[PDB]
Structure formats: C-alpha cells, structure tokens
Design an enzyme around this catalytic site. Sequence first.
Site, PDB file in Angstrom:
ATOM      1  N   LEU A  54       0.840  -1.186   0.000  1.00 26.82           N
ATOM      2  CA  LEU A  54       0.000   0.000   0.000  1.00 26.82           C
ATOM      3  C   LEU A  54       0.881   1.244   0.000  1.00 26.82           C
ATOM      4  O   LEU A  54       2.093   1.175   0.218  1.00 26.82           O
ATOM      5  CB  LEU A  54      -0.933  -0.005   1.217  1.00 26.82           C
ATOM      6  CG  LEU A  54      -2.089  -1.014   1.190  1.00 26.82           C
ATOM      7  CD1 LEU A  54      -2.699  -1.168   2.577  1.00 26.82           C
ATOM      8  CD2 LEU A  54      -3.155  -0.667   0.166  1.00 26.82           C
ATOM      9  N   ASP A  55       0.263   2.394  -0.256  1.00 25.96           N
ATOM     10  CA  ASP A  55       0.967   3.671  -0.233  1.00 25.96           C
ATOM     11  C   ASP A  55       0.390   4.554   0.878  1.00 25.96           C
ATOM     12  O   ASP A  55      -0.466   4.128   1.659  1.00 25.96           O
ATOM     13  CB  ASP A  55       0.907   4.353  -1.604  1.00 25.96           C
ATOM     14  CG  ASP A  55      -0.492   4.772  -1.991  1.00 25.96           C
ATOM     15  OD1 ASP A  55      -1.437   4.006  -1.723  1.00 25.96           O
ATOM     16  OD2 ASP A  55      -0.648   5.870  -2.564  1.00 25.96           O
ATOM     17  N   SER A  56       0.879   5.796   0.945  1.00 23.61           N
ATOM     18  CA  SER A  56       0.539   6.675   2.061  1.00 23.61           C
ATOM     19  C   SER A  56      -0.929   7.084   2.036  1.00 23.61           C
ATOM     20  O   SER A  56      -1.556   7.222   3.093  1.00 23.61           O
ATOM     21  CB  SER A  56       1.439   7.910   2.043  1.00 23.61           C
TER      22      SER A  56
END
Lengths: 459, 175, 178, 88, 124, 104, 165, 62, 67, 128
Positions: free
Chosen positions: D42-44
């Site tokens: 996942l990303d931020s």
Amino acid sequence: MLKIIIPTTMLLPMTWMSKHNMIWINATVHSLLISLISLSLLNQLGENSLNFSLTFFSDSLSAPLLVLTTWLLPLMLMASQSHLSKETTTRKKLYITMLILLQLFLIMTFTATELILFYILFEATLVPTLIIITRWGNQTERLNAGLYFLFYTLAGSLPLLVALVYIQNTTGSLNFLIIHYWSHPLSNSWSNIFMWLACIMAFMVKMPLYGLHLWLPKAHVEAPIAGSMVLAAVLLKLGGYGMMRITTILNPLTNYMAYPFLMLSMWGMIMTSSICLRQTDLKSLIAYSSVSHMALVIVAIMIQTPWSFMGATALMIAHGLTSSMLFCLANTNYERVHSRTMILARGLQTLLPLMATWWLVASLTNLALPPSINLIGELFIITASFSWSNITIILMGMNMMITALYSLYMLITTQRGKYTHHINNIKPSFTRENALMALHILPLLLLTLNPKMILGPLY
Amino acid sequence: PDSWDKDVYPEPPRRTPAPAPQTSLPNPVTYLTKIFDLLVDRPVTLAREFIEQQHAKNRYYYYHREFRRVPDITECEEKDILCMFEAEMQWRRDYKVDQEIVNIIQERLKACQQREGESYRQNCAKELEQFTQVSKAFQDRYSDLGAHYSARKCLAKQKQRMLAERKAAKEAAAA
Amino acid sequence: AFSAPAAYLTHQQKVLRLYKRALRHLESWCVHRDKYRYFACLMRARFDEHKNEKDMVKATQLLRQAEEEFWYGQHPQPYIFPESPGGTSYERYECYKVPEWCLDDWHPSEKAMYPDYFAKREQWKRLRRESWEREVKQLQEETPPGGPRTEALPPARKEGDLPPLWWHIVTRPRERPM
Amino acid sequence: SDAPPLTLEAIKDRVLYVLKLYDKIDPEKLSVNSHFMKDLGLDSLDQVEIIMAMEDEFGFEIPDIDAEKLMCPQEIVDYIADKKDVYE
Amino acid sequence: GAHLARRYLGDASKEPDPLRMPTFPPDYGFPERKEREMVATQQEMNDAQLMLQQRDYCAHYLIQLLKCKRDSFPNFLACKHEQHDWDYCEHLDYVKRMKEFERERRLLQRKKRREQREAEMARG
Amino acid sequence: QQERDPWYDWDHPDLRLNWGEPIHWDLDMYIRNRVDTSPTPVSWNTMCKHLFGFVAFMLFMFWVGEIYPSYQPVGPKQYPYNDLYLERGGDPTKEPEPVVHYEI
Amino acid sequence: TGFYSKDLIIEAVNMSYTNAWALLMTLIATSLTAAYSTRIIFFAFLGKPRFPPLVLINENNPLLINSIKRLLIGSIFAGFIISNNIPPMTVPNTTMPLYMKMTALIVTIMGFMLALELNNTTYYLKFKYPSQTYKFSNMLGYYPSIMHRLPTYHNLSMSQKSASS
Amino acid sequence: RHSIFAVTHVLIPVWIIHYYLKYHVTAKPYTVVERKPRIFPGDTILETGEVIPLMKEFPDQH
Amino acid sequence: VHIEPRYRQFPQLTRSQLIQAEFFSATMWFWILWRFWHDSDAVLGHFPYPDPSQWTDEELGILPDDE
Amino acid sequence: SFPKYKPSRLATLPATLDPAEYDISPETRKAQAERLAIRSRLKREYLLQYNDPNRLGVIEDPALIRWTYARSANIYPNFRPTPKTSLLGALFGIGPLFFWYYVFKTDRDKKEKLIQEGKLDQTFNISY
Ligand SMILES: CCCCCCCCCCCCCCCCCC(=O)OC[C@H](COP(=O)([O-])OCC(O)COP(=O)([O-])OC[C@@H](COC(=O)CCCCCCCCCCCCCCCCC)OC(=O)CCCCCCCCCCCCCCCCC)OC(=O)CCCCCCCCCCCCCCCCC
Ligand SMILES: CCCCCCCCCCCCCCCCCC(=O)OC[C@H](COP(=O)([O-])OCC(O)COP(=O)([O-])OC[C@@H](COC(=O)CCCCCCCCCCCCCCCCC)OC(=O)CCCCCCCCCCCCCCCCC)OC(=O)CCCCCCCCCCCCCCCCC
Ligand SMILES: CCCCCCCCCCCCCCCCC[C@@H](O)O[C@H](CO[C@H](O)CCCCCCCCCCCCCCC)COP(=O)(O)OCC[N+](C)(C)C
Ligand SMILES: CCCCCCCC/C=C/CCCCCCCC(=O)OC[C@H](COP(=O)(O)OCCN)OC(=O)CCCCCCC/C=C/CCCCCCCC
Ligand SMILES: CCCCCCCC/C=C\CCCCCCCC(=O)O[C@H](COC(=O)CCCCCCC/C=C/CCCCCCCC)COP(=O)(O)OCCN
Ligand SMILES: CCCCCCCCCCCC(=O)SCCNC(=O)CCNC(=O)[C@H](O)C(C)(C)COP(=O)(O)O
C-alpha cells in the site's frame, strides 16, 4: 463609652501577661467579648445622638463602624496566627499590641465630639499601621509602600489641622453639636474656597479619590494579611465619616466645589474597574475594586442627599466586610503557593470545594447581588445620582457591567479550568480558614434581614 | 377587624354576589374549599383558641407616649442653644409624623388601585387627589432641604416662599 | 499527542495532511455516504493525477494552489468529533480529573477504607523512588553535551530498568475518571 | 447505563473487520501484524484512508502526528487501547 | 390590501386618511341620521369591570357571556350561544366601521370630482 | 492561544503554554477565554461589509415602513359615552364636548 | 397547542395599524420556522444511518417515556383547555378577508414545500461551492465574529495600555 | 409510613402559613387586598340581599 | 428491559414503545379531526366578508353630485 | 482563480496560506532546528523536576516572573517624556474629565434654569 474603651485597653496587659502558647486564644476570646459588648450601641434614639459625656457620643453613623471594627479585630487575630507561627513570643505580643492600639484609636476616633480630638486620633491611627506594614510585610517594597501611605495621608491632613484651628478661632468652638446648631453659609470667596479645600482634601486622600489613590495598591498589597484587612475594611471609611461630619459647615459652597471631585470619582471608578480586568496580581485587583467602591461612596457624599448618605453608609459597611473576606481568600492561596500571581494556581475548585464556595459567595457579594446590602447601598447611591442628573446612569451601568466582569473573571481564573500539574503542595483547607470565611460572610447575609441598622442617621 | 381604625383605613362595603349554578356538574372549587376548611382552618382555629386562652391569663398593657408642645424655632433667639435644641427635636418629631401621614395616604392609594380592578382609573380619583394635595404640602415643607437639614433651613425655605408669594400678590393687586 | 514533534514537516507530510483535511471537509459538505464516497474517489483521482511529479518547485506550487482552493472552499461548520479540540465534549471531564498526589493528604480514617489499594500504592511509590536515580543516570548518559536535540526519550535498556520520566505518563488519572 | 467497557479482543476484532472490508487487502492475506507498506503493498494515501476509516469506526479522531506511524493493525489496536484506558 | 396600493402609489389626495377621518360632517349626505344607542349603562360596565377597550357598543353581549361563563363554570363548553352573539355584534360593528371608511372615500372622491369639474366649467 | 496546536503535549494544556518559554506581553488578553485572532473562513473587512449592510438595510426599511404603515380599510373605533370621558380619568365637573356617533 | 396562540398572533398582526416591514419580516420568519423544522426532521429521522456502527440506541426507560408522554399530552390538549378556560381579555378579530385569514397556513405550506425541495436536492451526486448568502446565514451574520472580537480587544487593550500603564 | 411526605411537606407548611396569614398578616390594614368580585345584572348580593336589575331588553336580532 | 448492542444491525425493539408511539400519533390525528369536525369555523372563518363595491349610495348617504 | 483571503489584526493569516513556509532555504531549516533544540532543552529541564519524587512544592518559572515584573515594576524605569507619550497622557487623562464636566454642567444648568421658570413637572417627587 468607657465600657468599650477600658476593656480594649485591658487587652494590652492581658496579652502581655499571657503564656507563650495562650496569647492567641486569650486575645480572640476577649476580642469577641468586646465585640459582643459593643454590639449594644445599635440602639439609637432617632431624633438626636447618644451623648454619653462631653468627650464621646454615639450616632447611627458611628455605631455600625464601631461594631465593624470590634468584629474585625478577632478575624485579624485568626488570620494572623498562621504566618506568625515561627515568630518569637515577644514579637507576637508586639504584633497583637499593634492591633489592639489600632482598635483603640479607631473606636475613640469614631466617637469624639470635637474635631481636634478626632484629628488627633485619626492621625494616631497612622503609626500602628505603618509599623505593621514595614515590620511584618513580606517583600522589599513594603518600605516604599509605607512611605507612600504615610506621606500621601499627611500632605492632605496638615492643611486640615490649619483649617480646624482657624475655624475654632473664628467660630469659638469645634464641638460637633455646636458646629451643627450654629451653622452659617460659606460665602463665595477665595478664602472660603481654600478653607473648603483644606477641610476636604484629607478625607479625599483617605478614601482614596482617583488621582490620589496610588498609595493604596502599594500599601494594601505589601502589607500582611491583618494589615490589608484593617486597611480595606475600616481605615478607608475614616475619610467618608470625616466628610459626613465636616460637610455640615461647608454649605452652600459644596454646590459647585464638588464638580471636579464628582467628575474624578465617576471617571476614575470606570478607570479602576477597567484596570481590574488586566491585573496579574490577585491582591492588586481587590485593591482597585476597593478604589472603585470608594469612588462611588465619594459621589454619594458629594451630592448631599439623604438617600445618598444612607447608600454611602450601607456601601461602606458592605465593602469593608467583602474586601476583608476577599483579602483572606487571596491570602489562603498565597500561603499555599507562596506567590500572588493569579494564573499560577488554577482549577482550585477541584482540590478545595468549600473554599471555592466561599470564593463564589465573596465574588457574588462583590458584584452586589440582590438583596445584599452591597446592592442596597449602590442602588440608593445610583438613585440619588439620577436625581442629581439623569446622565449619571450611563456611568453607573458601565461600572456595574465592568464590576461583574472582573469579579467573575477572578473567580473563573482562580477556581475553574484544570489544576496546575507541577503544584502538588495544596493541602486540605484548615478549620481556621473556613471558620474565618464563615465569620466574614454570615454577618453580611444577616444584615440583609435588618438593613436599617447600617443605613445611618438619615433613616 | 376592629384592631385598626376604619376611618384612617377605609374600604367600600365589600359587595359580593351569591352563587347561581347553571349546570348539574359539581363545582370542584366548593369541594376543595370544604376539604381545605376541615383540614386546615379548624386545627389552626383550635391552636389559636388555645394560644388566646394562654394569653388571657397574662394581661399587661403598654402606653402611647405623649409629647408636650414646646416653642418652635421661630420664637428662639439667635444664640439660645437650649431653646434651639428643643425646637429642633420637636421639628424632627413633626417631620417623622408627616412622613407617616404620607405613608398612610400612599397605602390608601395602593389599596384603591388593587381593589378597583379594571376601573381603577375612575374609582380612585379621590385617593389620587388626596395624595396630590398631601404630596404638594410635603414637598413645599421639606423638599430640597438636603442632608444636614434643620428647622432653621425649613424656616428659611418657608420665608423665601412667603416673600415670593407676597410679591406676586402685591404685583397682582396693581393689576 | 504521544509522539515528539519534529523540527519541520516534510512536503510528503503536508501533502497527506492536506489530503485528510480536504476529505474531511468534503464529507462535511457531502452528508450522505454514497455521494461522499463518489466525490472522495474523485478527490483521490485528482490527487493521484500529480502523484509521480519529480520537479519539486511545481509540486510546491501545486500544493499552494490546492491549499488556496481548500481555504476558499472549506466548510464554515465542519464536522468535529465530540472529544476533539473543537467538539462539544472536548474538555467535559477535566473537572473530574484529580491528581494522584492528593491521596497522600487523605485522613487516616479515609485510608482505613480501601486498605489494599493504599498498600499497592505504597508498592508503586517504593518502585518510583527506587527507579528515579537510575532514570536520571540513564538520561545523563544518553544525552549529547549540548543538551537534547528533540523531545524524544529513550526506553529502558537494563534488566530492572524503567523508561526515564514515566511516573506522570503511567499515572494519568483517566479519560473518564468518575 | 452507558455502553459496556471496551476490551482488547473487541478492539482487535473490529480493526480486522474494518481492514477486511477494504478492497485492496486480501482477507486471507491480512494479519494483525501485517505491515501496510511492506506486506500489503500500500501507499501513504491508503494509510490515510485506513486511519480515517478507523476514526469513523471508533468515533474519535487520531492526530496526524500519531497516525503517521500506525503501519500495522497491532499498532492501531495498541493506540486505541492506550487512549481509552483499556488494559484487559 | 388594494387601498394601501391606491393611497401610497396613486393619488393619495383621492384616498381617506385613517388618522384624520371622517373629515365630512356626519349629516352631510344623509337627510337624517339616527344616533347609535347603548344597551349597557356606565354603572353596569363599571361593576362588570370589563376593560376600557371592551366597553364598546357590544358590551352587553360581553356581560351576558361573562355571566354565563361564571355560572356554568365546570362546563366550559356550554357558553356557545353567548360567544356567538358577542362575535356577531362585534362583526356588525366592524362592518359599520368599513361602511364609514367607504362612505368617507366616496364622499371625498365625489367632492374632488365636482369641485374640479365646476372649476373646469368656470374657466371656460 | 487559540491558534496554538491543541494536539501538542503542553506543560499547561488549558493555557497552551510551555514552562520556561517567553510569555507574550498580552497573554491575559489572549487566554482564549477572551479575544481570539484565529483565521476565519471569510475575510475580515468582508464580514464587516455584510453585517453593516444588513443592519443599515433593516433600519432603513423599518423607517420606510414607519412612513408607509399597513392598516385595514376601516374607520376609527367608536365608543359610547363621549369616548368614555368619565372612564379615562373622569373630572366629571367640566361637561365634556358631546361625542356623538351615528349609525350607518 | 401552537395554533391557539401563534395563529391568533398572526391574525392580530395582520389586522393592526402596524409597520409594514415588521409584518413582512414576521411572515418570512413564519416561513423559516417550518423551514428549519423540516430541516431537523429530514436530517435527523429520515434517510439511512450515518452514525458509528456500534448501535447503543435504547429509549426503553420509564423516566424518559413518562416525562415525554406528559409533555406530549400537554402539547396536545393544553391549548384548547386553557383557551376555553379563561375569560376573554382581547377583542376577537371576527371579520377579515379569506386570503388574509389563510396567510399563516399559506406561509407555512410554502416553507414546508420549499425547504423539503432544497433538502431533497442534496441526494444528487452534484457538488457546488456555497453562496455568500449561505456563508452569512451559517456564520450567524458574522455578528459573533466581529462583536466578540473588536470591542473586547479594544476595551482590554485600553484597560491595560492607557488606564493601567 | 405511607403518607409521611404528604403530611410533613404539605400539611405542616400550610398550617403555619394559614395561621400566619389569618392572625398576623390580616391583623394590619391593607396587607391582603383582593380586587372586588365582578357584579353582573341579575346578580344577588350576599350581604344586603340586593338584586341588580336586568339590562335593558335587547333588540333580539335572533 | 435489557437491550444489548448489535453492531451494524437494526436495534432491538420492544412492543410497548411501538404501541405507545402509534397510540399517541393516532391520538393527535384523531383530536385534530374531531376539532375540525366541531370547530371548522376557527380555521375557515365564520362571518362573511362584505364587499364595499356592493354598497349603494342611498344606504351610504352621498348626494348625486349635482347639489 | 478563487477569491483571495486577506488577513487582519483579529483574523490572522493561516499557515497554509503563508508564502513563508513554502519558500524554504537551508538557513530556515537551521533556524527551525535551533528553535526545536531550545524547546527540547527547556522541556527536559522542566520534566526533570516534574517527575522528581523528592521535589515538593511549586516549580518556579523564570518566564512568568519576568512577565509579571515587566508588566508591573519595569514600566516606570523605561518611561521617557515624549511628544507621543505626553499627548496621549494628556488626552486620556484630562479629556474625559472636561467632557463629562461640560455634559453634566450643561444638563444641570438647563434643569436649574427650567426650575426657576416654574416648569419642570415635579409633582410627586418627594424622595431625593
Ligand atoms: C402570493 C404570496 C405568496 C408568496 C410565496 C413565496 C414568494 C417567493 C419566495 C422566494 C423567496 C426565497 C426562495 C428561496 C431562497 C433560496 C432558494 C435558492 O435559490 O437556493 C439556492 C441558494 C442557496 O444557497 P446554496 O449555495 O444552494 O447552499 C449551499 C448548500 O446547499 C448548503 O446546504 P445545507 O446542507 O447546509 O442546508 C441547506 C439549507 C440552507 O439553504 C440556504 O443556504 C438558504 C439560506 C438563505 C435563503 C433563505 C430565504 C430567506 C430570505 C429572507 C431574507 C429577508 C430579507 C433580508 C434582507 C438582507 C439584506 C442583505 O436549506 C434549507 O434547509 C432551508 C433554506 C430555506 C428554505 C425556506 C425558504 C422560504 C422562506 C423565504 C420565502 C418566504 C415565502 C413566503 C413569503 C412571505 C411573505 C410574502 O440561494 C441563493 O443563492 C440566494 C438566496 C436568496 C436570498 C435573498 C435574500 C432577500 C434579500 C436580498 C437583499 C435585498 C436588497 C438588495 C441588496 C442591498 C442593496 C443596498
Ligand atoms: C486624574 C486623571 C489623570 C490626570 C493626570 C494624567 C494626565 C495629565 C498629566 C500627564 C499628561 C500631561 C503631560 C504634560 C506635558 C509634559 C511635557 C514634558 O514633560 O516634556 C518633557 C520632555 C523632556 O524634555 P527634553 O528631553 O529636554 O526634550 C527633548 C524632546 O524629547 C524632543 O522632542 P521634539 O524636539 O521632537 O519635540 C518638541 C517640540 C515639538 O513637539 C511635537 O513634535 C509634538 C507637538 C507638541 C506641542 C503641540 C501639541 C501637538 C499636538 C496637539 C496640539 C494641540 C491640539 C489641541 C489640544 C486641545 C484640544 C481641545 O515641542 C513643541 O513644539 C511644543 C510647542 C507648543 C505648541 C503647542 C502648545 C499647546 C499647549 C497645550 C495645548 C492643549 C491644552 C489642553 C487642552 C485641553 C482641552 C480640554 O520633553 C518632551 O519630550 C515632550 C515635548 C512635547 C510636549 C507636548 C505636551 C503636549 C501635551 C499637553 C500639555 C499640556 C498639559 C500640561 C499642563 C501644564 C502645561 C504648562
Ligand atoms: C489628581 C487629583 C488631585 C485633586 C484634585 C483637586 C481639584 C481642585 C480644583 C478646585 C475646583 C475649582 C476651584 C475654584 C472654583 C472656580 C475656579 C475658577 O476657575 O473659576 C472662575 C474664577 O475666575 C478665574 O478663573 C480665576 C482663577 C484663575 C487662576 C487659577 C489657575 C487654574 C489653572 C489650573 C492649575 C491646576 C490646579 C491643581 C494643581 C494640582 C470663576 O469666575 P469668578 O466668578 O470671577 O470667580 C469666583 C470667585 N470669586 C467669587 C471670589 C470672585
Ligand atoms: C449600554 C452600556 C453597554 C453597551 C455595550 C458597550 C460595549 C461593551 C464592551 C465589553 C467589553 C468586555 C471585555 C471583557 C470580556 C472578556 C473577553 C471575552 O469576553 O471574550 C469574548 C467572549 C468569547 O467569544 P465567543 O465567540 O463566544 O467564543 C466562543 C469560542 N471560543 O464572548 C463575549 O462574551 C463577548 C461579548 C462582547 C459584547 C459586546 C457587544 C455588545 C453590543 C451591544 C449593542 C446593542 C444594544 C442592544 C439594543 C437593544 C434595543 C434597545
Ligand atoms: C497628598 C495630596 C493632598 C493635597 C491636599 C492639599 C490641598 C489643601 C487645601 C489648601 C491648603 C491651604 C489652606 C489654608 C488653610 C485654610 C484657612 C483659611 O481659610 O484662611 C484663608 C487663607 O487662605 C490662604 O491663604 C490660602 C492660600 C494658599 C496657601 C498655600 C497654597 C498652596 C497650593 C494651594 C492650591 C492647592 C490646594 C488643592 C490641591 C489638592 C492636591 C492636588 C483666609 O484667611 P484670611 O487671611 O483671614 O482672609 C479673610 C480675611 N481677609
Ligand atoms: C470539500 C472541500 C475540499 C477541497 C480542497 C482542495 C483539495 C486539493 C485538490 C488537489 C490537490 C493536489 O493535486 S496536491 C499535489 C500532489 N503531488 C505531489 O505531492 C508530488 C510528490 N508526491 C509525493 O511526494 C508523495 O508521493 C505523496 C503524494 C505525498 C504520497 O506519499 P506515500 O505514497 O508515501 O503516502
């Protein structure tokens, strides 16, 4: 009147002959007994005063002040004994001696029949107060405060002495009865104008009048707790009593000689109420509130109406009791945290609930909640001013609003919010402190049932 | 009752109507009044009867103090302190009596206004004019004397008014 | 609230905070859940449009323009959680929080009630008094000569050591103390 | 009275429930210690959305300075337990 | 509304003024006018204590209604006929006031018409 | 003090101050029980125009409506006994002018 | 309960020598009353849930039910009972035009309809920035934004800088 | 113990007040003042037995 | 009456609250209908409103402009 | 694009609208680090006394003492008679006094001259 004076004098050898551990008990018990005895002077004849002898008399104006002084002495003793515990026996006896001498001078001052005796005792009150402030004050500014307190008073009082001796030379007497019965109008001349000023300025500076009030914050903040109690409760009322006694011979000149003093009093009560809104020291706020209340009293005295004098007497009594209670409340917290800064200790209601109740009641009486005698006096003065001029209501209402504002500001700052985290030396309230607050507050509420006892001769 | 004089504190004959019911429905106010009577007014009456029985066994009297009429301030010479003092005491007593007279008239006016209901503006004209007359007299006697008032200042005010009235009458006589 | 702050916020942190604020204010504007979800995916797409920008200057200018847009289009009455600094219940229970040192001033008759609690409190006080000196020594050891640079505190590293400056963190009164 | 006291097991179950209702996470793959950036890829922004979903779930706001470091479900459970004074 | 629009937007000189009205004599256009009468005396209204604003020409029905309210106290729904009579008399009074308004308006309009018309006839 | 970070771990949380930090000269004015300087969604000097315009418009319209009142097309209310001369203050010894009402 | 007083108040305001602006503002306020009542009902009781998932909804307490029931019976019957059980202290308005008799009801129905329409339009998947009138209404006309900041700041600043110092 | 509250909080306070009003307050003039009851035509006075005559024969527009 | 949370399901309902709410809503509506049946004049008006244009000059007493 | 927001005294500029925090230089980062270090050192000094088991009392704060001293005792020693100071003092001191004297004197002169004319309607005024 000797039945009051002689026991007060007997208080001195009694406390000088007591054991090292019994001085407070003996002094408190016999001071309370003397107050009980002095309570019998409230029976007033109506038409004229009670003339015990050639030297002393009692009036409907003098009797509440005498009772207030006699009642204030035991409260002063109760408040003093906490911070004087480390003192030697001789110095504690000297402190109690100062208090007793101050009481004696005050009780003799309010009953003198002749104006030179009144002046002598009214100046004699200076020495014990000065000694108390400069010897048992806590900070280094007590010396400057004492110098201010002494010289502000004397610079006004000496011309009063000159005027009194001149008046006795011209009239032949200074006995208050002869003064009143043989009163003649003061003409419109420069000599009469300066006689008026010399008769007025001493009582002006004792109130204090705005512009001559700079000594009061210094003296009231820098004095020990008992000194502040007696300064606010009783010593401020000497000026008002002197004005009521002396304006009998000043008519009809007061009709226009009072204009600058009325202007100063109204605008300065506004100014001091505003000043109370931005104050970092808790005692200075109480001092400035005292200044505002005494400005209102000055207006009441200057306008020369029966309702004005009644309101002024009621306001003097109520302000004395309320200011003494507020000073004691501030002193308790100062003894806890050893600092006078208001925002240092916050949220004290969480830690001291009963003291918070005392704070709330004192703040409510300071803002003159009905039907307390504070509002009785204030409303009578406001009505008299409205009769004097309808435009005074603007300033009176502004002063009421600002008074409520800073009273509740002080209450909220000291009692509400969250406590200061690092301060962890706040012990539960002692029986002595709670009893002192109760003994301050209960007479205030009891006087509401019988307001005519403090309304004065014009009733 | 008969405790107070009915001439100083008068009231109308207190006409009240008779009940004229118009429905068979029972009146709850009458039943509540009977309950209140039987539960409150009888025990209170019995307690008062016992209290009066105890009071009757101990009867003593108190008297109204009468004051002689001493010479007033007009017949005192300029520096006679004793006559001045007695005249001033008499004047203060008269001032208190006049205040109480005005108080009685004000009580009459208030009672009339409350009693007359919606017709107070018409049925209280006599009390209003009585109060107007007494108020004018009391004002002329004592107003603007200020604090530190005395019989001498009242005499001076009266003399000033008399001089003004005499000048007005004399100037009207030439008209 | 629990983490020591840094000297400054990076561009990435500012970008995420702006994203969260925009999403919350859009939820305030879009009351219903489905419409909020639709416009939140639209916001996410518009936000990812410049995800892989390499020029820092233009990224900063985009951030400034986005902040201006957010300020002009923010909700004047955004939804706030009740316990949040703007909520209707933010500091409601602060008057019920009494510090633990007040228990030492209790009367012995008050401590006659609750004996086991006060015995355990005595145990806790002995623990604190026996750990304080080691805490101070560890703080002196692990600190640069020119004073601490951040508000971060080290953990315990020995066998029977406690993390320095722990008493007033462990002995919080409560969130609902009464 | 009010709601029953919260427990660690309930917090963890609710956190896993919210994460299993997320589309970008395999239900089988997800674990309490499963890292968001490393394990789930996942990303931020997805982490910000997860934090907002947790706030909506538990009805309280997590400050941004603290939410930045919640990179696994166990950390979120610990944060929630420590904030609401849940010890068992 | 229409009268307000006529007065404030149109020629206000053609519209009656509610404050100063009627300005014409009460017997101007009528040959003979009957004086309005009263059923309730001053003393009856003073004893009933109605109000200074309820002592209009409808006061007798109000007295009847109040008496019937007082006698039939527990049944507060039984005084329907008296209330209807008082309302009808008040409505008749209001209709009379509206007739007075319309009469003043028409009289003023006719007076203006006729005086400018006689001036127009005299100028030629 | 209202503009300071509420999520920071202040030494004095209500005060939003830290021990040993310099204190503003007007702290007691800014204690957040009092004057707030926090940024507003709508610019200052824009809210002022809207507020002043609303109040001025309402005042001017009230004055206009006072000049142009609303009423019903009716005549003045009529009262029996010389407009209740004896009732509205009396003085029954001065023979009031006959106020006579006629039917229509 | 609200009929017997509010509708009589509107009737008396309509039939009096009164300021026209005050009458118009009273009518607009009568519209806005139904407007915010509809807002409350629509946003609080209709639609789908928007609260956190853990449902604690429980109104099965005798105290709450009994008290609300007592005030409900009051709100239903007190108007009629009190209106019929007091003497007439106001002269009734018996003769008024029909459209002017129904003004309050027309105003209330207009408020209902228009507020309901504007509330139904928020379901649409369309987003627009607020108007300036909305900002004026939501922020209370900016009265607390200015009157709570300017006079207080000036008063305290003069109290410190001028009076004290 | 069923009716302790109604005898100490209602019956005792009204006993003191009724005694206080009936024998102390009403012992002085103009302390309790009632507006006089309304009189209508056809009413009968309780004290004097007077009958107020009826009111002038309405036109009876039935 | 013990009711427990349900976590994303419609809350548990008791019969008493439902019947009380329905009864009181029905009471309100029945009262409104009964009043409108018995006091319809209070809402629809009772006395007719006269039309000033329907008034002749003979009953209103104005001369025919020629005197 | 969108309408701009302008700050004032009582509604200041938001941080996100401040161009200063978006134009960053290494010296700005150094200044921020220095400020953070000062804050951290003060926090450590406070927390070492706050958590001390031995310590009993109020922890004195030098900053509060400085604030109170500056607001109360340090004002007069730093006062200079200046045209600004002199004019402001004269205005705020004696202007209101003369204003109120004029207002009250005019009102009372009108009232007294109207009394001498015999026209004040002082009926029922027996209390003053
Ligand atoms: C035959 C006679 C019968 C007459 C029948 C009717 C007669 C005509 C009626 C038409 C009049 C108003 C109609 C509705 C207005 C708004 C509808 C609309 O278009 O919506 C779009 C929009 C609403 O904003 P938005 O962007 O959609 O909202 C954002 C979200 O939706 C935010 O969404 P949210 O979730 O936050 O909640 C939405 C919320 C919030 O929605 C709003 O934001 C609306 C708030 C303001 C508008 C409310 C209207 C009330 C206006 C009263 C003003 C009185 C004079 C004040 C003077 C101010 C001077 C500056 O909406 C509601 O829940 C309810 C809102 C109002 C519903 C009820 C309104 C009806 C009452 C007014 C008409 C009275 C009818 C009977 C007549 C009685 C006498 C005959 O409206 C506008 O943009 C303009 C509104 C017009 C207001 C003008 C104010 C009048 C005075 C202006 C100044 C005059 C002087 C000249 C300047 C000075 C020169 C020196
Ligand atoms: C109980 C409540 C509270 C009451 C107590 C509190 C309030 C009262 C007490 C405190 C306030 C009163 C203070 C009195 C002033 C003290 C001055 C002082 O200490 O200077 C030492 C101080 C140290 O001397 P230094 O170090 O050797 O000199 C180097 C200078 O710093 C180097 O400076 P520079 O070279 O840059 O500037 C110097 C130069 C240039 O100065 C300037 O650049 C500024 C202009 C100053 C003079 C003119 C004022 C200009 C602005 C206002 C003009 C008047 C407006 C209208 C006023 C009435 C409105 C109705 O000076 C001039 O040119 C002045 C020439 C005079 C022309 C105007 C004369 C007007 C006399 C008074 C008129 C108003 C009467 C009151 C009306 C009230 C109606 C109800 O000298 C100054 O720095 C100040 C110089 C400026 C003084 C201006 C004074 C204006 C205030 C009114 C004075 C009247 C009140 C006093 C009554 C007794 C007067 C005989
Ligand atoms: C900070 C607070 C300190 C205390 C404040 C004390 C206030 C003292 C002020 C005294 C009030 C007024 C004093 C005298 C009343 C009138 C003064 C004079 O201005 O009035 C005119 C007087 O005319 C001239 O003005 C003469 C006075 C001019 C010289 C005085 C100098 C004033 C300058 C202000 C100096 C500040 C004084 C206070 C220092 C601290 C009236 O004209 P006139 O009817 O013909 O004379 C009446 C007197 N007669 C009957 C004997 C003839
Ligand atoms: C007639 C005499 C009085 C007239 C008014 C004169 C101006 C009064 C000036 C009072 C100054 C007092 C300042 C000291 C108060 C301490 C600071 C303070 O109160 O803070 C402001 C505090 C906090 O603000 P919030 O927005 O509520 O915060 C919530 C979120 N944080 O709010 C307040 O209490 C401020 C109140 C200021 C009132 C001043 C405006 C009043 C103007 C009245 C004029 C209208 C007259 C009415 C006409 C009636 C028709 C006849
Ligand atoms: C701490 C601050 C308080 C300051 C108060 C000071 C003000 C005191 C009032 C003036 C003091 C002097 C009064 C003199 C005593 C009065 C006696 C008297 O009436 O005699 C006068 C004498 O009058 C004077 O000599 C007064 C002249 C003034 C002498 C000193 C002046 C000092 C400054 C005076 C103005 C300041 C006073 C008020 C200021 C208050 C404080 C600011 C007339 O006597 P005869 O000569 O017989 O005349 C009639 C037959 N031909
Ligand atoms: C309801 C009213 C609200 C509306 C207000 C307006 C909202 C703003 C509209 C548009 C905003 C933008 O385009 S803002 C421009 C966005 N562009 C960039 O940030 C370029 C560099 N990207 C990075 O540094 C990281 O990848 C990062 C993106 C931080 C993710 O980090 P993680 O992957 O490590 O979590």
